[PDB]
Amino acid sequence: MISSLWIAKTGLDAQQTNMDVIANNLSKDVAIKGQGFFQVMLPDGTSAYTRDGSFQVDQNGQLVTAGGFQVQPAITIPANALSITIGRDGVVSVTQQGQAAPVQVGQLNLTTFMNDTGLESIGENLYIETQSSGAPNESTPGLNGAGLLYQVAEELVNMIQVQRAYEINSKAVSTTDQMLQKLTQL
Amino acid sequence: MISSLWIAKTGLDAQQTNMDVIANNLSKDVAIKGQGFFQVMLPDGTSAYTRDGSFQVDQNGQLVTAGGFQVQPAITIPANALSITIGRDGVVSVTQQGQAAPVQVGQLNLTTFMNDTGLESIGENLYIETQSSGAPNESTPGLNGAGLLYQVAEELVNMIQVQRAYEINSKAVSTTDQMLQKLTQL
Amino acid sequence: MISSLWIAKTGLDAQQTNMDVIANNLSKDVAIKGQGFFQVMLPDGTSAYTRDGSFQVDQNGQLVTAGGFQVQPAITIPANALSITIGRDGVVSVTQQGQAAPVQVGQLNLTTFMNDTGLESIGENLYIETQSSGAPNESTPGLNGAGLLYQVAEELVNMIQVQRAYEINSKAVSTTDQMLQKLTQL
Amino acid sequence: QSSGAPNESTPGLNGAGLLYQVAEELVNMIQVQRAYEINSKAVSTTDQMLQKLTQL
């Protein structure tokens, strides 16, 4: 019985989890068509990975975001000139004030892991490597492992049903307990 | 009387069991349309069987799951290339970076038992062979014994009624005992 | 009572089934005006039957579909020439690069069964012959048994009502049980 | 692999002809889209039914 309670409980817990997961579903912008993650570093120098393509050039040049974080390895962008572009391969090229158009101002690197499941979620769809994930393997878009850069309610349904399930589960448990109490004592 | 108590007891026990059973009822995904189980091995090398189709390719190639467990016998998957497919027969074919499309990278094997009842439940719908089950017989989907890969509340009702039953049972027992006590002594 | 429960249960089960069935209701394209099924074979060589007219010519000529499956018996199509046509009788004729217009490149065969009910559903409106169905009888469109090739919510209503029915059924059962419990003990 | 290898030729020869020199879908989509709406409706009722049933 207690076990049953546990059993019900566990299921109920799942149901909530499922629903929650269900809930969790339903300026330069670069997207990765296929597999791979962009590699990113914090001010500490720790490396992190993310599919999120949104970047802004901050005060410092280095590919800095809304926060200021730059990109690796040896390639920054601290000028005005004309514009800049990110090619399909990830090469960054620009037209500039210093009267030149550089190619490969820097080229973005991409990473892949043996198991994505292993990755530890920092939040904001940023992830960190773990023992389980395996080490990151680096490459560039359009070569080897990586493709080129390109340029829900059902869950809710689930969650509702799953959520419902626990409600059922509780119901069953209660009855028994009542039964027990009724039984106690015959 | 004690016997009756036992009798009631046994029934009551069943009732709980029934209810519990009642409770127990009500990324590549492959399903088995007909009979058969997928064959799976742990890190120890022990073999287990399961209908559950959910698999993920882990860091190692071998059909590894959320845990990392691979699949038998001689067929893994440690690359990126393009994609991969599992045919109806269980053959795994892929399109790859190593400029080739392999067929039968490996073919999944299926197992059947003389009596499924005999199988010992590990949990998570995974089962192990026993003396009672008989040895696993191996085959492939779409041949011989096995069909191709394809691509509740009533219990509650029962349980409630069954649960109720014991409550009745206890009631009967109590009365007698009371009767006995009343009888004691006349 | 238990029987009644069963009775209710059975009805309830049906109600769901009915609703479900209710749910289940509401490039060359060839349609069969009257009776008959197209005959089709898998890579294994097993024969299957379907009314579905949709076919595509795959890389191999043989009437291959989105999958590649061809058609029987002796008639393929592996060329470009101009076009191709399927006559009312099922004859396939083409205009071709090999400077000829063939007639009866091949002619499609149609099959009929003593009882369609017997047919076993593979899915995707494809069926396989069974003992119950009887053997397929072959013919061509426009001859004998077969006509020439040509060139719902109510269910929902039902389902809802039927679904409702079980709800009623359960209600009745519950009352009795309550009655019993009330009765127990008077 | 599925496509097969490309076979090459020139326009006007063999396999290739010379170089020369919708809403219905919408209709479909709307109806099809509608369909799921129906589908959901059916499901909900049953669940409600179940809940109503639970417990009788």
Residue numbers in the entry:
A (entry chain A), B (entry chain A), C (entry chain A): 1 to 26, 92 to 216, 226 to 260
D (entry chain A): 196 to 216, 226 to 260
The authors write:
Here, we obtained a ∼7 Å resolution density map of the polyrod by cryoEM helical image analysis and built an atomic model of the distal FlgG rod by docking a homology model of a core fragment of FlgG into the density map and also by modelling the terminal helices. The helical parameter was converged to an axial rise of 4.13 Å and an azimuthal rotation of 64.75°. The resolution of the final 3D image reconstruction was 7.4 Å (at Fourier shell correlation (FSC)=0.5). The density map showed radially arranged two domains, D0 and D1, with domain D0 facing the central channel with a diameter of 13 Å and spanning a radial range of 6.5–30 Å, and domain D1 forming the smooth outer surface of the polyrod with a diameter of 125 Å. The model fitted well as a rigid body into the density map, to the level of secondary structures, such as β-sheets, β-hairpins and loops, indicating that the main chain folding within domain D1 does not significantly change upon polymerization to form the rod structure. We thus built an atomic model of the FlgG rod structure with residues 1–23 (D0), 91–222 (D1) and 227–260 (D0), but we could not complete the model by filling the chains in the two gaps (24–90 and 223–226) into domain Dc, which connects domains D0 and D1, because the resolution of our present density map was not high enough to allow de novo model building of these two gap regions. The atomic model of the rod clearly indicate that the rod is rigid because the D0 domains and the D1 domains are both highly packed in all the three main helical directions: the left-handed 5-start, the right-handed 6-start and the 11-start (protofilament) helix, in each of the inner and outer radial regions of the rod, respectively. The D1 domains of FlgG are oriented more upright to form the tight axial contacts, whereas those of FlgE are more tilted from the axis than those of FlgG by about 7°, giving rise to an axial gap of a few Å along the protofilament.
The flagellum is made of three distinct parts: the basal body, which functions as a rotary motor as well as a protein export apparatus; the filament, a long helical propeller that propels cell locomotion in viscous environments; and the hook, which connects the filament to the motor as a universal joint to transmits motor torque to the propeller oriented off-axis of the motor. The rod consists of four different proteins, FlgB, FlgC, FlgF and FlgG, with an adapter protein, FliE, for their assembly on the MS ring. FlgF and FlgG are 26 and 29 kDa proteins, respectively, and together form the thicker, distal portion of the rod with about 20 nm in length and 13 nm in diameter. The rod is responsible for the stable high-speed rotation of the motor driving filament rotation up to around 300 Hz in S. enterica and E. coli and 1,700 Hz in Marine Vibrio15.
